[PDB]
Amino acid sequence: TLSILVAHDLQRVIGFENQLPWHLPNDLKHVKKLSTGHTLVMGRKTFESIGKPLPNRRNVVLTSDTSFNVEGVDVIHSIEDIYQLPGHVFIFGGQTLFEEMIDKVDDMYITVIEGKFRGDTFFPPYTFEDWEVASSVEGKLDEKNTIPHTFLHLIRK
Numbered sequence: 001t002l003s004i005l006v007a008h009d010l011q012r013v014i015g016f017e018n019q020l021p022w023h024l025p026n027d028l029k030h031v032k033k034l035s036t037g038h039t040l041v042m043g044r045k046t047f048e049s050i051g052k053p054l055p056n057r058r059n060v061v062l063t064s065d066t067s068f069n070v071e072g073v074d075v076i077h078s079i080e081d082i083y084q085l086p087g088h089v090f091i092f093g094g095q096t097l098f099e100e101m102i103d104k105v106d107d108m109y110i111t112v113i114e115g116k117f118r119g120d121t122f123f124p125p126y127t128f129e130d131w132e133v134a135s136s137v138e139g140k141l142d143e144k145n146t147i148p149h150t151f152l153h154l155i156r157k
């Protein structure tokens with residue numbers, strides 16, 4: 001299974017100056033629950049913005065840099081290498097990897113952040129004409145999660 005995992009706003013903003021524009025604990029839990037025990041594939045800039053692998057799953061980084069070798073991270077150098085990865089693989093960002101992979105994935109786990117933020121990186125445009133809504137669940141608002149948000153699971157038709 002090859003999936004996209006992404007959070008984007010009403011205009012498909014995903015990032016700003018190598019950071020997420022929002023702070024949403026419910027979304028991090030969501031990500032943990034989905035990917036624990038599986039594989040995350042991410043671009044080099046995305047990895048460096050956090051700088052540490054996420055524990056309890058395989059962390060894979062795509063980069064042209066043949067000197068890359070981080071403790072607890074696996075490296076690949078070609079998009080083609082993604083297909084050799086075993087198990088459930090989640091394309092985890094950022095913009096460049098999303099653009100490269102959106103036409104190739106089976107399904108998408110999207111957190112729609114119902115706001116308009118300033119961004120410099122975007123999720124590519126897509127149409128529901130090509131994607132069936134397997135599920136759509138509103139996030140609960142509270143003290144620490146104060147932006148409305150919706151978890152979508154979309155499956156390519």
Ligand SMILES: NC(=O)C1=CN([C@@H]2O[C@H](COP(=O)(O)OP(=O)(O)OC[C@H]3O[C@@H](n4cnc5c(N)ncnc54)[C@H](OP(=O)(O)O)[C@@H]3O)[C@@H](O)[C@H]2O)C=CC1
Nearest residue numbers: 006007015018019043044045046063064093094095096097
């Ligand atoms: N809201 C969300 O769900 C998410 C948001 N983000 C955000 O996205 C932004 C970063 O996106 P972006 O700038 O596009 O960077 P990326 O994370 O997509 O990294 C780009 C780098 O990945 C490597 N790479 C990509 N494709 C290839 C390839 N085909 N072959 C070899 N290497 C490749 C290259 O590394 P190299 O230059 O070393 O060769 C390239 O420079 C940040 O703001 C981040 O916060 C990221 C993930 C999720």
Ligand SMILES: CCc1nc(N)nc(N)c1C#C[C@@H](C)c1cc(OC)cc(-c2ccncc2)c1
Nearest residue numbers: 005006007027028031050052053054092093111
């Ligand atoms: C969650 C934000 C998020 N939400 C959703 N729905 N999809 C995503 N793909 C991401 C994401 C992401 C990237 C920036 C990312 C990569 C990473 O590579 C290790 C670690 C984290 C991370 C480690 C720990 N705490 C917060 C974030 C985030």
